[PDB]
Structure formats: C-alpha cells, structure tokens
Write an enzyme that holds these catalytic residues in place. Structure first.
Site, short mmCIF file in Angstrom:
data_model
loop_
_atom_site.label_atom_id
_atom_site.label_comp_id
_atom_site.label_asym_id
_atom_site.label_seq_id
_atom_site.Cartn_x
_atom_site.Cartn_y
_atom_site.Cartn_z
N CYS A 1 0.85 -1.17 0.00
CA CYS A 1 0.00 0.00 0.00
C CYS A 1 0.92 1.26 0.00
CB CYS A 1 -0.88 -0.05 1.24
SG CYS A 1 -1.96 1.42 1.28
N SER B 1 -1.04 1.57 4.27
CA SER B 1 -0.64 0.29 4.87
C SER B 1 -1.61 -0.85 4.51
CB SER B 1 -0.62 0.46 6.34
OG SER B 1 -2.04 0.65 6.75
N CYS B 2 -2.55 -0.54 3.64
CA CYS B 2 -3.62 -1.41 3.31
C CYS B 2 -3.10 -2.81 3.01
CB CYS B 2 -4.32 -0.83 2.15
SG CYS B 2 -4.84 0.87 2.38
FE LIG Z 1 -2.92 1.45 3.41
#
Ligand SMILES: [Fe+3]
Ligand SMILES: [Cl-]
Ligand SMILES: [Mg+2]
Lengths: 197, 212
Positions: free
Chosen positions: A101, A105-106
């Site tokens: 991501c 931070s996905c």
């Molecule tokens: Fe993310």
C-alpha cells in the site's frame, strides 16, 4: 527550523484519547479489549497459509480462489474488516507478484494478519513500486531478470494475497505440512516458500 | 492531495528494515498500539462520526514534517483525535488535559472535496485506459505516479463503493462506483529508471477515461 512540535509522550496521548471517549460513554464495555483480541489472535497469516495449501492440493479450489477470492475465503469463514473483497494473484514460472500500500498500509488483515512494521515503512512504500527486483534482493529473495515482477498497489477496497508457486520436493505432502512453509512474507509476495534439505 | 504521504517512486530511501521471514515481534509492540484502530472502529461503526476514508485523509493532513517523523500507529492516534475534535465529540483542551501536555493535531482541510463524477464509463477487461489528468487538493485514491498514464484493465470489481474524494470529506454525494485493476508497464510509469515489470493500481471508475 524544521524542528518537531513539542508533544506529550505518545502513550499518554493514546490513553487520553481513550479516556476522553470512554468517560463520555462512547466506548462499549470490553470494546477495545475485544478488538485487541481479534487483531492478535484471529487475523493471522496462518489462515492465508491454509488457503494456499488447499489451493495447492485441490485444483477446483485453486480455480475458485483465483476467480472469486471472496467466495473461496468465505468457505473457511475468514472474511472480515479490511478483507471483504479478496483477490488472489498467482505466481508462475514467468511472473512474481508483490503487494504494497504505497499510500498507507492497506493489507488483507484477516488472512495475512495486520501489516508488519517493515511493510508500513517509507522505504517499502517508496521503493517497491519502482525497484521491486532490488528490494526483494535486499530482503533475501532473488528474482531472475527474466521473470516479470508485478506490484499490486492496494489503493482502493480490493485486498490481495499472493498464491506462490509450489516448490519442488513437496510432492505428496499433507495440507498441514504445506501450510507450515507458507509464511506471512510468502502471502505478501516478498518471499518464496522454502523446503528444508 | 499531493502530500508527502504519496511516496511511491520517491528516491533516496535506504534499505527496507526486514529480511525474509525475520522475526517481526508481536502484533503490537507497545501497550497503547491497539487503541488507534480500535477507536477508529468505534468512530466508524459505533458513533457513526466518520468514514474510514476520512481517517485516511486526516492522516494525509498531518503537517508534512510531522508526518515524516511520526511512527505509523501514532499517526492514527493523531488522526482519530483530530476527527473527534473536528466533529465536535472532543475538544483539544480536554485531550491535552488528560495527556498532561501538548497534543498537536492534523491541519485543517484546504478542500471541501468533490462529488462522484457525473460522466464515467464502464470499462471492460482488456480495454486501454488513461488515468485522468486532474489535480485534486482533497482526498484521492490515485497515487501521482499513475496520473496521465496509460494501462490495461485486468479486472472490474463486482462490487461498488463510495467515491473516496467525496466520502473522505464526509460528503453526501459519494455515490458508488466499481474500481478497476489497471496494469501499467513499469516503463510507462518510470521510463528506464525501474527494474520491475508491471504495476497494478486499483483505480475508481471516476479516475479513468478511454485511452486514445
Ligand atoms: Fe494502506
Ligand atoms: Cl470516461
Ligand atoms: Mg507527489
């Protein structure tokens, strides 16, 4: 010039946020403790490894996982927050997939676990999209200059897992044996599953 | 928002702090770290006070130097706190009183957002698309490396979701759109200055147009 703002200790600020909300009755009893438990115990790369070992041994499931990841994951009961729409991406002898991501931070939490510190680093977020071969190399994974590397940037709601190639020397292993060599890093795409000698 | 958080492609960073299968420690490395996520979910699902998209944006709105020196979980403490104050649930005074010291928040938004575009196209797998050459000062789920670039559709989602550039500002006109896995050649994004093969970006319909 360029100096940090004065801040209270982060633990003090985090607990203050909690206490301000909780003192207003806005946080149900047990609510944060419940989430801590879910994050630490339920959301886990062991689930993604289960899925991979199934796919490796069951051509029909592998097909389902690759066409409709969400349905495949739902059969095990592993859909959840930040993992409601799942796409699995398949390594081949000419393609290595890697997930990031770049904007935050996905990650597919329920089946990969929460992201580790390194995945959220500015270094990973900046570099893997432009020089994934070098980044993987530095991390201990060599990908020959022939194999295409394909980086998935997790910029909307799709939540990804990598289906790594099955390595030689695992023929006839049980689903438990195969699960054991599929690690978090294999699901993210930075590592290839390792067979002992 | 063309903020410092849009890191893909930036040069000068060192080694990623990991080698494969190294010990990453426990999920939470400090006793407060489960709080930002848990409190975000209370905000979204219990209070109804904001969306997840608003969380992403409020972290984007951290003062840039502040963003760059702040560890990840702390950014979401600051973000969630900011949204609680902005939505009138908490005050900064009470936060700083409880914390025993300064609790600086994210900066105010400089954009009201934008609606889901009225005119869009339903794209098909294999079709060539260009990322719209648009600049959005508010929240957007398009990293700048792909703006104006051309790729091919690998997947159209079978679900749809609110347009981030609206819902990330708490607007009532986010509509719903599918997203598209758009595959770009590495050389389309970075010229000769890449060692990769392809990059797949998951792009809302309203960020795309047919490619000439
Ligand atoms: Fe993310
Ligand atoms: Cl269009
Ligand atoms: Mg930029």
């Amino acid at each position: 010039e360029n100096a940090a703002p004065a801040q209270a200790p982060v633990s003090d600020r985090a607990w203050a946020l909690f206490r301000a909300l909780d003192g207003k009755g806005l946080v149900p009893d047990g609510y944060v403790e419940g989430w801590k438990k879910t994050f630490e115990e339920d959301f886990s790369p062991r689930r993604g490894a289960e899925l991979v070992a199934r796919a490796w041994t069951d051509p029909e499931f592998r097909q389902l996982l690759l066409t409709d990841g969400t349905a495949a994951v739902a059969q095990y009961g592993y859909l959840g927050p930040q993992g409601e729409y799942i796409v699995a991406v398949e390594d081949t002898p000419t393609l290595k997939n890697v997930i990031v991501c770049s904007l935050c931070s996905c990650t597919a939490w329920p089946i990969l676990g929460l992201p580790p510190t390194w995945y959220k680093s500015f270094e990973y977020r900046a570099r893997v999209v432009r020089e994934p071969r070098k980044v993987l190399s530095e991390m201990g994974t060599e990908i020959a200059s022939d194999i295409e590397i394909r980086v998935y940037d997790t910029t909307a709601e799709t939540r990804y897992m990598v289906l790594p190639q099955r390595p030689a020397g695992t023929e006839g292993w049980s689903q438990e044996q195969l699960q054991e060599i599929v690690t978090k890093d294999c699901l993210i795409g930075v590592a290839i599953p390792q067979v002992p000698t | 928002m063309d903020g410092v958080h849009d890191l893909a492609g930036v040069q000068g960073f060192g080694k990623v702090p990991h080698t494969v299968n190294a010990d990453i420690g426990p999920t939470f490395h400090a006793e407060w770290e489960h709080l930002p996520y848990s409190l975000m979910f209370a905000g979204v699902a219990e209070l109804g006070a904001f969306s997840v998209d608003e969380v992403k944006y409020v972290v984007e709105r951290m003062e840039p130097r502040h963003y760059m020196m702040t560890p990840y979980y702390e950014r979401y403490v600051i973000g969630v706190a900011t949204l609680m104050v902005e939505k009138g649930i908490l005050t900064q005074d009470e936060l700083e009183s409880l914390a025993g010291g300064p609790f600086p928040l994210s900066r105010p938004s400089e954009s009201e957002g934008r609606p889901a575009p009225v005119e869009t196209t339903t794209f098909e797998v294999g079709q060539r698309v260009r990322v719209r050459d648009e600049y959005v000062p508010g929240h957007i789920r398009m990293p700048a490396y792909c703006r104006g670039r051309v790729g091919t559709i690998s997947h159209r989602t079978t679900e749809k979701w609110p347009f981030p550039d609206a819902i990330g500002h708490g607007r009532n006109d986010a509509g719903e759109e599918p997203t598209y896995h758009v595959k770009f050649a590495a050389e389309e994004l970075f010229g000769s200055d890449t060692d990769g093969g392809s990059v797949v970006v998951d792009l809302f319909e309203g960020y795309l147009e047919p490619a000439a």
